[PDB]
Design a protein around this ligand. Structure first.
Ligand code: HEM
Length: 117
């Protein structure tokens, strides 16, 4: 009963993160930020990161959220787009509103670490 397990665990996270990128990469608000990103690497990192954040195993070895988005000067509308695409991804995969809201509430604390950096 971590949020990770409530979402369905490792197989669920492995399905969720590439679907979240399919949506982010179609979203006019954000898709261009990933123009030059190795998407295989990014999907691995973000899988490790959300797995750690939502109380699964902690194997995340990448940058902190300020370092990861340094120099992007990201704006509030970009963060809303990301959270909205993650919520729609979890909804499409059959997660209840309550469990999505629990997830979003944890992720929301990162917003001040990545905006405007
Ligand atoms: C606010 C809008 C966001 C945008 C536009 C964005 C975009 C990006 C981009 C383009 C990179 C790759 C940088 C590179 O290839 O050099 C990246 C790295 C990453 N972002 Fe975001 N991101 C955003 C929000 C988030 C959120 C909400 C999270 C999770 C809470 C997150 C987690 C990560 C992680 C784990 C990395 C990888 C760091 C590493 O490779 O060491 N990002 N982000």
């Amino acid at each position: 009963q971590t949020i990770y397990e409530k979402l369905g665990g490792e197989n669920a996270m492995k399905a969720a993160v590439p679907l979240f990128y399919k949506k982010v990469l179609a979203d006019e608000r954000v898709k261009h930020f990933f123009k030059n990103t190795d998407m295989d690497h990014q999907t691995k990192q973000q899988t490790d990161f959300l797995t750690m954040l939502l109380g699964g195993p902690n194997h995340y070895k990448g940058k902190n959220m300020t370092e990861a988005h340094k120099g992007m000067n990201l704006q509030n509308l970009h963060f809303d787009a990301i959270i909205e695409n993650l919520a729609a991804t979890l909804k499409e995969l059959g997660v209840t509103d309550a469990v999505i809201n629990e997830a979003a509430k944890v992720i929301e604390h990162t917003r001040k670490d990545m905006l405007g950096k």
